[PDB]
Design a protein around this nucleic acid. Structure first.
Ligand SMILES: Nc1ccn([C@@H]2C[C@@H](O)[C@H](COP(=O)(O)OP(=O)(O)OP(=O)(O)O)O2)c(=O)n1
Ligand SMILES: OC[C@H]1O[C@@](CO)(O[C@H]2O[C@H](CO)[C@@H](O)[C@H](O)[C@H]2O)[C@@H](O)[C@@H]1O
Ligand SMILES: [Ca+2]
Ligand SMILES: [N+]
Lengths: 415, 553
DNA sequence: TGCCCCCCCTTCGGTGCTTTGCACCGAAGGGGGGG
């Protein structure tokens, strides 16, 4: 007896028509078992070829989770679905979530299945389950309730969500709660035991609504312990010609971010035509030029602030030895955050696995700090990434990405 | 009329009306054979005659069935297809026999008049109107509309293939011990049951299909092996592709080579070692489809090597899920690679080849990575899992490559196989400058208008050179300056350039290039013992860079 | 002189940084195959 919220697409846009990619045996058995149970509960229904729309689908296992979790690549549908900020169903982002000592992420996507979906919009949520060796043609389904991973589900459910959270928000006014897609971010400054206690209270608080992948899992963050990776100039007392050449090339690049850096007195050290391994001392004017440049790299960049109307862009660099650097920005050279990852999972043996973990880590930080998911510039070949990335994905969302190929002519972010 | 099965709603694109294309002249031999087939569809109820209120029409023609005395009716619905709504095809791929498991009992069936056994959408039948000449356009003739799925409509294959699955879905769920491969109207059914219980379930399916208006004639009922299925021959323990005809013509046209390479690609799925590099290299060039091409000395040998592979009959085996999958790749040279997928040695499930040349500059290590990715996707398609790889590359070679490359790259669980020619890296750039090696400061420049330029170097030992270049570019002179330094240097050399373009190419350690100049640079790099490359910004008054920039500009 | 799907090989035009040359990629047209 719940009336459906009508949903429209962005004017001048058709529906998603993205082909289903091959799935491994373990993922197909997981989807067939899940989609059969979702069909009994009326949450999905079979469709035919008259529906021209389709969205890829596969399955994942979250961190330290042994059971499968259906995941739909609604990226193309989300871009074509009306932005709910214009219907005022948008969720404001609390600036204090990044300040709490601990933040726990909860998969609350299972609650969306209770709300029906607009009949005229169900045709866009179509997907297809493939068969091994194409034994059976595509078995197409479509959603009848709010699907997980769609940007419209938390917006429509937000009215229902704030009511369920009212008793807990009033008993604990110092706790920040943010909702993004199928996740619920809960942050507090309490002790770890009292924090997990308040988290367990919020779980059982949801079961009081459930009676009237599952909720039991949670992942702990510590945004107060998040650091940044600044540009650093190495400290040497004897410089070779090659050392100074690397330094001038690095400072020349860095001048695009810090316009106060000069290399006039350092370049004049490279006046002659010397062998690269020749050690050359620093002139008096060059010592002041180097010292003054380190001070500029300490102070912040002028005019760098977050614009809520612009997209976030993330670049990642493979530094080797399990090291990975990244920068988040909206306008070029106006970085909002820089960072470096090391000893992640898959280090020293799997680049695609480490890159997948880095993309997840960066997106999580972006959601906590700004409430957005950036578009990634991945240092990997297109075919290399699209072959393996699903095997290592452990998140309920999927960010936008493109592929680049930039040789590291200047070791800028990592010496 | 009678109602066969559950229909599918079909619409036109918004604001679009039906087709009005009329009919082209038809020869009398075809006009005569068409009116006979039209009467049969009226009798069975597949086509209605009333269409004076129908302003639409679509041209119709007819061609004979593949090596069969029957003529096929076809309607050129190309104008209707532009106006029909889009469908999502449920056909995602092609089944392969290498993915089949061994079964004790096998049966193959073909559905009679499949497209004509499924009711068309009621409201859409008006747009399928068509006219046929009665007697050379003397009299008006007979107009008709389709009451079933017509051959030539873009929605016919998807609608039939989906309705076929809905009918088989209850039979498959109530018989889990059975395996059914459905592809269009052809049916594969296999089980480990005794042939008596098998022929029983086969007839149960034959009645069930007849319980929805689908016939299964005995002329296409295959009961005895070898089963002809998807262009193969299915024996109980082995499978093989149907025989392949190689054109042996002495005067090769462009269209002949296209047919030749196409058949070699199809053969490479079970015949190992097929090469098509030199044969396809003859097709490159804007030549007409009728121009005769003489076969080169390398393409003639390549054709002869392929002929020797097809002389002996080869067979594949079936999949055993209890055993691991093994994929072994061999390098064939000139960017050619072949692979075999097997579970027990010398018993190949299938073979294949990767010869794609992507990028202007590459190496064998990149091409091997791409071949592994092709096999991985192919294996997930057929068997749903990634095979263990045996690669002709040493662990040390691969470790050095991926740890030092700036892009993320990886190969799944694999082991080394010492099958020459081994893939290796032909040179490695030092990470630190070489002590005691001469330092070359190279640069180039070219005039954007005259396409003339200079390229040279200057070293710390006083050595200099400048060379004038004609019909060149800024990028070519920058590459040329590096080539000059490599030619005029010892076995160990430091080279400082400002060319981002050249440094990006060389640092990726290519061993082959479409550019003659880059290949000559590669040849010099292999001769050297230690090479160090460094980049400096231009016009910054840095070392020899400011000096050599003046010499070449 | 029809429709639908998959594969490889070549060409061509669009795209974005290596920049106004060069490298990459996806579409398209040739062929193979299936029904
Ligand atoms: N050239 C072709 C070949 C096939 N088809 C599709 C594929 C299939 O879905 C259907 C053919 O229906 P039929 O049942 O008539 O197929 P046959 O020629 O084998 O006829 P028979 O054995 O029953 O005497 O139409 C098609 O459009 N055009
Ligand atoms: O990895 C990119 C690859 O994915 C596809 C199909 O799944 O598109 C998906 O990814 C794009 C890049 O983020 C999105 O723009 C798109 O919406 C999403 O479906 C392919 O288009 C692409 O090759
Ligand atoms: Ca048939
Ligand atoms: N220059």
């Amino acid at each position: 007896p719940i009336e459906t919220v009508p949903v429209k697409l962005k004017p001048g846009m058709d529906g998603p028509k993205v082909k289903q990619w091959p799935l491994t045996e373990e993922k197909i058995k997981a989807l067939v078992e899940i989609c059969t149970e979702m069909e009994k509960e009326g949450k999905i229904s079979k469709i035919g070829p008259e529906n021209p729309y389709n969205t890829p689908v596969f399955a994942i296992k979250k961190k330290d989770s042994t059971k499968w979790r259906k995941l739909v690549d609604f990226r193309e549908l989300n871009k074509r679905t009306q932005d709910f900020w214009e219907v005022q169903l948008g969720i404001p982002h609390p600036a204090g979530l990044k300040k709490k000592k601990s933040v726990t992420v909860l998969d609350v996507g299972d609650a969306y299945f209770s709300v029906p979906l607009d009949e005229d919009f169900r045709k866009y949520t179509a997907f297809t389950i493939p068969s091994i060796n194409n034994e059976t043609p595509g078995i197409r389904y479509q959603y009848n309730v709010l699907p997980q991973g769609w940007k419209g589900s938390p917006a429509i459910f937000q009215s229902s969500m704030t009511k369920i959270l009212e008793p807990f928000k009033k008993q604990n006014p110092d706790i920040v709660i943010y909702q993004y897609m199928d996740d619920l971010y809960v942050g507090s400054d309490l002790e770890i035991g009292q924090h997990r206690t308040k988290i367990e209270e919020l779980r059982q608080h949801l079961l009081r609504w459930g009676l009237t992948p599952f909720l039991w899992m949670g992942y702990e963050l510590h945004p107060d312990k998040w650091t940044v990776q600044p540009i650093v100039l190495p400290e040497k007392d004897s410089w070779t010609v090659n050392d100074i050449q690397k330094l001038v090339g690095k400072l020349n690049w860095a001048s695009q971010i810090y316009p106060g850096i000069k290399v006039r007195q350092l370049s004049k050290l490279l006046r002659g035509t010397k062998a690269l391994t020749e050690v050359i001392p620093l002139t008096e004017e060059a010592e002041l030029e180097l010292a003054e440049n380190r001070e500029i790299l300490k102070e912040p960049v002028h005019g760098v602030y977050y614009d809520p109307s612009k997209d976030l862009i993330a670049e990642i660099q493979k530094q080797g030895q399990g090291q990975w650097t990244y920068q988040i920005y909206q306008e070029p050279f106006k970085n909002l955050k820089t960072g470096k990852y090391a000893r992640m999972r898959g280090a020293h043996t799997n680049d695609v696995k480490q890159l997948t973990e880095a993309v997840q880590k960066i997106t999580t930080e972006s959601i906590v700090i700004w409430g957005k998911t950036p578009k990634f510039k991945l240092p990997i070949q297109k075919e290399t990434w699209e072959t393996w990335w699903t095997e290592y994905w452990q998140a309920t969302w999927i960010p936008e990405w493109e592929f680049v190929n930039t040789p590291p002519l200047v070791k800028l972010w990592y010496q | 009329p009678i109602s066969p099965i559950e229909t599918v709603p079909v619409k036109l694109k918004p604001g679009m009306d039906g087709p009005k294309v009329k009919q082209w002249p038809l020869t009398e031999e075809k006009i005569k054979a068409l009116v006979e087939i039209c009467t049969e569809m009226e009798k069975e109820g597949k086509i209605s005659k009333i269409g004076p209120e129908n302003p639409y029409n679509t041209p119709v023609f007819a061609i004979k069935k593949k090596d069969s005395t029957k003529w096929r009716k076809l309607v050129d619905f190309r104008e209707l297809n532009k106006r029909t709504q889009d469908f999502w095809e449920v056909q995602l791929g092609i089944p392969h026999p290498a993915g089949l498991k061994k079964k004790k009992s096998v049966t193959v069936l073909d559905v009679g008049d499949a497209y004509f056994s499924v009711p068309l959408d009621e409201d859409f039948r008006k747009y399928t109107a068509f006219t046929i000449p009665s007697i050379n356009n003397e009299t008006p003739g007979i107009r008709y509309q389709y009451n079933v799925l017509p051959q030539g409509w873009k929605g016919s294959p998807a609608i039939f293939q989906s309705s076929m699955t809905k009918i088989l879905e209850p039979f498959k769920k109530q018989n889990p011990d059975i395996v059914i491969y459905q592809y269009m109207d052809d049916l594969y059914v296999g089980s480990d049951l005794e042939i008596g219980q098998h022929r029983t379930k086969i007839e149960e399916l034959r009645q069930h299909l007849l319980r929805w208006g689908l016939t299964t004639p005995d002329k296409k009922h295959q009961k005895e092996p070898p089963f002809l299925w998807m262009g193969y021959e299915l024996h109980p323990d082995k499978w093989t592709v149907q025989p392949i005809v190689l054109p042996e013509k002495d005067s090769w046209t462009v269209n002949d080579i296209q047919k030749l390479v196409g058949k070699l690609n199809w053969a490479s799925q079970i015949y190992p070692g097929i090469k098509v590099r030199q044969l396809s290299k003859l097709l490159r060039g804007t030549k007409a489809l009728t121009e005769v091409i003489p076969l080169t000395e390398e393409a003639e040998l390549e054709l002869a090597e392929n002929r020797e592979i097809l002389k002996e009959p080869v067979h594949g085996v079936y999949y055993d899920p209890s055993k691991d999958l093994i994929a072994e790749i061999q390098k064939q040279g000139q960017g050619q690679w072949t692979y075999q997928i097997y579970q027990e040695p010398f018993k190949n499930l299938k073979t294949g080849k990767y010869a794609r040349m992507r990028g202007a500059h590459t190496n064998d290590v990149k091409q091997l990575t791409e071949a592994v990715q092709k096999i991985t996707t192919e294996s997930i398609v057929i068997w749903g899992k990634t095979p263990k790889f045996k690669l002709p590359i040493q662990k040390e070679t691969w470790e050095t490559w991926w740890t030092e490359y700036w892009q993320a790259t990886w190969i799944p669980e694999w082991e080394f196989v010492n099958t020459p020619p081994l893939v290796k890296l032909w040179y490695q750039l030092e990470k630190e400058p070489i002590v005691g090696a001469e330092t070359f400061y190279v640069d180039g420049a070219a005039n954007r208008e005259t396409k003339l330029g200079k390229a040279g170097y200057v070293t710390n030992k006083g050595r200099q050179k400048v060379v004038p270049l004609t019909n060149t570019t800024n990028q070519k002179t920058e590459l040329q300056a590096i080539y000059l330094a490599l030619q005029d240097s010892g076995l160990e050399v430091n080279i400082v350039t400002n060319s981002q373009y050249a440094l990006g190419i060389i640092q990726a350690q290519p061993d082959k290039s479409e550019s003659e100049l880059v290949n000559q640079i590669i040849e010099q790099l292999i001769k050297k013992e230690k090479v160090y490359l460094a980049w400096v910004p231009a016009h910054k008054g840095i070392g020899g860079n400011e000096q050599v920039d003046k010499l070449v500009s």
